Structure 1
């Protein structure tokens, strides 16, 4: 499922082809070169995201995973993870503010985590900010016109529109959140 209907964007094509919309205008919005992964921990919690392997977001993601995963010595903060989840709407507003997006992201990550212990994790914060901004830019480039035209479609049911319309900012936030949770899941031992 992850390879077919998520990584290869076969949800979009299949859903449109079932209702016989398809057509060349929508086919040019089909996206490929994507990585999709899910992590089902022993409990039933799924961490599932998809990202483009074209562009700088993938290389920043790989460098972050190389950086903050301990070997067998940059330090990792675990409370940023719950900040991403809880403050997702605020991060969406900050990302959608185009003119001052980087400045607002830095100010938000500085005003939160504004304590003495957080001075040692400035590298993590700025890495997260840059990766999130890159992910949002690639997301908007890949999805904005697609979402706009899907919204205007006159035969699609609201359920299909909702499962097809991908929010550019929340998907980037979720990608960063899942990357951070994968880092924490690798790092933390039950000791």
Structure 2
């Protein structure tokens, strides 16, 4: 992740928000573990949403609302909103950091395909992976095996 932006700030706030604090014992906003598998499984559709221009925010909100459409998900609207905001910020940072770099790497006919592929970073996919890894870290800290 790049610390020169709001994605790092939002990532820190999300971690602090959804990590259980045992030292206290009043409460923290609850966590939905099914969002972790949704991010992994629906990654291609999320990439399609992210690559959409000037409609990605509404599309992301609609996707998360329409996938988590049950009465039990009324409590996790804050988590869904935070995930959407962080994902959009990370996609913007990744395109602004990597689009020109990738398009100059792609047509640099000195490197073979293997090193080009190891050098070419997909912005939307990297943002999805970052959000997924952050959610997995939250779950790993939160989950105990009593």
TM exceeding 0.5: yes
Output the TM-score relative to the length of structure 2. Answer: 0.96
Structure number with the bigger relative contact order (C-alpha 8 A, sep ≥ 6) is 2
Take 1:155 and 1:91, find their aligned partners in 2: how far apart are those partners?
A: 33
Question: Residue 123 of structure 2 corresponds to which residue in structure 1?
Answer: 168
Take 1:98 and 1:70, find their aligned partners in 2: how far apart are those partners?
A: 36
Take 2:94 and 2:63, find their aligned partners in 1: how far apart are those partners?
A: 21
Question: Residue 157 of structure 1 corresponds to which residue in structure 2?
Answer: 112
Answer with 1 or 2: which has the greater Rg.
1
Take 1:141 and 1:186, find their aligned partners in 2: how far apart are those partners?
A: 32
CA-atom RMSD in angstroms: 0.4
After superposition, give the CA deviation of every residue in 1:32-51 in whole Å (9 maximum; x if it has no partner): xxxxxxxxxxxxxxxxxxx0
Size of the alignment, in residue pairs?
A: 141
Q: Which has the higher helix share?
A: 2
Take 2:131 and 2:98, find their aligned partners in 1: how far apart are those partners?
A: 18
Output the TM-score relative to the length of structure 1. Answer: 0.73
Q: Secondary structure of 2:20's partner?
A: coil
Moved over 3 A (4+): none
Take 1:186 and 1:156, find their aligned partners in 2: how far apart are those partners?
A: 41
Task: Tell me by how many angstroms 1:190 deviates.
Answer: 0.8
Q: Which has the higher strand share?
A: 1
Task: Tell me by how many angstroms 1:167 deviates.
Answer: 0.1
After superposition, give the CA deviation of every residue in 1:142-173 in whole Å (9 maximum; x if it has no partner): 00000000001011100000000000000000
Question: Residue 35 of structure 2 corresponds to which residue in structure 1?
Answer: 80
After superposition, give the CA deviation of every residue in 1:49-107 in whole Å (9 maximum; x if it has no partner): xx001110000000000000011111000000000000000000000001200000000
